[PDB]
Design a protein around this motif. Structure first.
Motif, PDB file in Angstrom:
ATOM      1  N   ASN A   1      -7.554  -1.232  -1.092  1.00  0.00           N
ATOM      2  CA  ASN A   1      -8.229  -0.479  -2.600  1.00  0.00           C
ATOM      3  C   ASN A   1      -9.092   0.405  -2.434  1.00  0.00           C
ATOM      4  OD1 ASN A   1     -11.169  -3.062  -4.622  1.00  0.00           O
ATOM      5  ND2 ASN A   1     -10.537  -2.443  -2.266  1.00  0.00           N
TER       6      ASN A   1
ATOM      7  N   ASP B   1      -8.567   2.299  -8.035  1.00  0.00           N
ATOM      8  CA  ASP B   1      -8.726   1.905  -6.817  1.00  0.00           C
ATOM      9  C   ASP B   1      -7.403   2.527  -5.969  1.00  0.00           C
ATOM     10  OD1 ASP B   1     -10.681   1.194  -7.564  1.00  0.00           O
ATOM     11  OD2 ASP B   1     -10.409  -0.554  -5.894  1.00  0.00           O
TER      12      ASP B   1
ATOM     13  N   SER C   1     -11.881   1.007  -3.534  1.00  0.00           N
ATOM     14  CA  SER C   1     -13.722   0.525  -3.489  1.00  0.00           C
ATOM     15  C   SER C   1     -13.723   0.589  -2.101  1.00  0.00           C
ATOM     16  CB  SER C   1     -13.750  -0.197  -4.700  1.00  0.00           C
ATOM     17  OG  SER C   1     -13.456   0.367  -5.906  1.00  0.00           O
TER      18      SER C   1
HETATM   19 MN   LIG Z   1     -12.253  -1.668  -5.719  1.00  0.00          MN
END
Ligand SMILES: [Mn+2]
Ligand SMILES: O=c1ccn([C@@H]2O[C@H](COP(=O)(O)OP(=O)(O)O)[C@@H](O)[C@H]2O)c(=O)[nH]1
Length: 304
Positions: free
Chosen positions: A293, A196, A295
């Motif tokens: 991050n 990420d 994601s």
């Molecule tokens: Mn993540």
């Protein structure tokens, strides 16, 4: 060196390795002659590991991978090592983890014995049920805390091994005998990032509180420690061993939460007021050249 005490901020050379990990339950998803690291247009993880490497060419970059991979996928990994001297790819099969083990039977018995000491009124009754049942069932086959973490743990598989790898830390690159790595020494540190994490510009040296810092996320108005970032001064950094101590002692302990977050709290004696958010600010791994991050915006690598 913030409160309560004074803590020696530490600094580690540019020659600090970087660590990535990819654990794939399903190596069949990818082809049999290419890299078993995922890079969907939603989640270009392998591309992120490639981008990071280029920039910090001086630094070592390691990838910790496990799964039952087909040879051309291993041959594919071997090629990338040729492509970039700074990239090393370490497998779980190639690292001894025995020292960090504690057999499942003992964990339960020590909990039983401790629970049995207090009188029938005081004892945790449901817990004792779960312990004795677990003891009898887990008997079948092999009782090791590491073996306990399988693909079927799913989430647990990589979280727990993430802590094992960071415990080994620098030693991990040395242990595998990965080559082109004459910068560093045993009892040397390493930085874990999720894929990420996108890295804009090379980071240089960093000050971390006591040889450790971790990712912190602050939503909605609250912050909790995150495992997306783990920075260590050291192999076998006392915060992780304390977290491992929970792994060895606490029944049904989660490696993500207990293995690390709790370990860190233990090391700095947080509890409890001790307002957290500022402590999270103290422990927070801060950098202006990392996005975290990624994601968050799209879908977690774990499908949903
Ligand atoms: Mn993540
Ligand atoms: O199948 C997977 C998915 C993720 N990861 C690891 O977990 C990180 C990414 O997980 P992500 O943050 O996307 O999930 P989230 O924690 O946001 O739910 C990567 O760096 C990988 O090391 C893994 O080992 N196997």
């Amino acid at each position: 060196s913030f409160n309560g005490k004074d803590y020696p901020l530490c600094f580690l050379d540019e020659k600090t390795p970087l660590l990535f990990q990819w654990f794939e339950r399903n190596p069949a998803r990818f082809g049999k002659n290419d890299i078993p690291i995922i890079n969907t247009e939603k989640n270009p993880y392998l591309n992120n590991i490639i981008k990071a490497a280029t920039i910090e060419k001086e630094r070592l970059i390691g990838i910790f991978v496990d799964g039952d991979f087909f040879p051309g996928q291993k041959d594919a990994f071997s090629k990338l090592e040729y492509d970039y001297e700074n990239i090393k790819v370490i497998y779980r099969n190639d690292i001894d983890f025995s020292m960090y083990d504690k057999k499942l039977s003992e964990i339960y018995m020590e909990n039983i014995s401790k629970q049995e000491s207090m009188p029938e009124e005081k004892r945790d009754c449901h817990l004792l049920q779960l312990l004795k049942k677990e003891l009898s069932d887990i008997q079948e086959g092999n009782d090791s805390l590491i073996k306990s973490y399988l693909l079927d743990k799913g989430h647990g598989w990589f979280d727990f091994y993430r802590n094992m790898a960071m415990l080994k830390a620098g030693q991990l690159f040395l242990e595998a005998d990965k080559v082109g790595c004459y910068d560093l020494s045993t009892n040397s540190g390493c930085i874990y990032l999720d894929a990420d994490m996108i890295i804009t510009e090379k980071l240089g040296g960093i000050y971390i509180p006591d040889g450790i810092a971790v990712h912190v996320e602050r939503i909605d108005g609250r912050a909790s420690m995150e495992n997306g970032i783990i920075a260590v001064d050291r192999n076998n950094h006392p915060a992780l061993l304390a977290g491992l101590e929970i792994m060895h002692t606490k029944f049904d302990a989660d490696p993500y939460s207990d293995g690390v977050c709790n370990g860190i709290r233990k090391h700095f004696n947080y509890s409890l007021n001790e307002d957290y958010n500022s402590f999270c600010d103290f422990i927070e791994f801060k950098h202006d050249n990392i996005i975290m991050n990624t994601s968050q915006f799209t879908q977690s690598s774990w499908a949903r």
